[PDB]
Amino acid sequence: SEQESVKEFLAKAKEEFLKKWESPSQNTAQLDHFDRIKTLGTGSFGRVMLVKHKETGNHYAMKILDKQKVVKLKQIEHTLNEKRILQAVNFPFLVKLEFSFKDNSNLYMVMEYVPGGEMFSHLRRIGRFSEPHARFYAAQIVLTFEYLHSLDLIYRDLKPENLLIDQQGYIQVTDFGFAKRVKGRTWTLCGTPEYLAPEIILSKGYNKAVDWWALGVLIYEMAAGYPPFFADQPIQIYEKIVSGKVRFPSHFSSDLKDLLRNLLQVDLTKRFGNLKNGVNDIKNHKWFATTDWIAIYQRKVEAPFIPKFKGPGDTSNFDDYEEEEIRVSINEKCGKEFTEF
């Protein structure tokens, strides 16, 4: 039976995860093993740099966090979450953490370099994706959330800026800064305005259903070319999110609108992904009837496009950023807070 095969897959994946979750890797490289090349992108907490490993010549993407800034911004526990989770997961659509380490000043997470750029860039440039193309990407996120949620993990920052396109045209999810292992509910106000579920905005307890809401926002944005709730300032976005009103482009199919209303339910107890049948309400929806879930997992479906590749170390699929010096103090900062990193 197909359903038993999925249960067995997830049970073994949890056994594998828990071993790494309980005994995390630590201190697996050092800064002078790498030459720093160029900044690939930024987030609210730090930057990610293209680096080259001196001995092998391999390129990687290195996230750098300033320990004192993390402390000042009250992100200590979130940063410990990020690294502990990312070193423990293993999934086709999650970026691989290759090394991690810290020094007197900074924390470092060295990932596989995903060269095709952010989905964001491609989506803005082309305007919108066709429904088949949006469906190809969406299916990868559905499987990824099935995996993460089965491990008690909530992701909490889905958006095109965090979905990188690999050389086969498939997604790699990056930025686990808000990911958290939780059984039952949590309360932190975090995420990106356009993607926040109503229960986050309204300061309610919330659960994995916020990721399913965010999937609704993502699919809408991919297929429309703009988000379902947009404005010039966050507060106006929040008013629209909580209203229960959503409007769809005239070109959206019947099945797409039906799926989206089910994911964009303002009452989390009525939201797809959070009903008795869980993820299967999504996987069995008419909009996904042509999706071969195992073929997607195995990366056997033809991709909408292959990013352009001009040799190793090429960053032409990414914007340019102002560069700043990575300084390392002679004195250790915030040692006790980051002991476990």
């Binding site: 987030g43 609210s44 907490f45 800064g177 808000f178 926040l196 703009y226 010039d232 966050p234 409007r247």
Partner: peptide, 18 residues
């Protein structure tokens, strides 16, 4: 059009977390 209203808005670039 809704598209034109989005393209003229202030939130068409990369969006940061709150």
């Amino acid at each position: 059009t809704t598209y034109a209203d989005f393209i003229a808005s202030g939130r068409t670039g990369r969006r940061s977390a709150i």
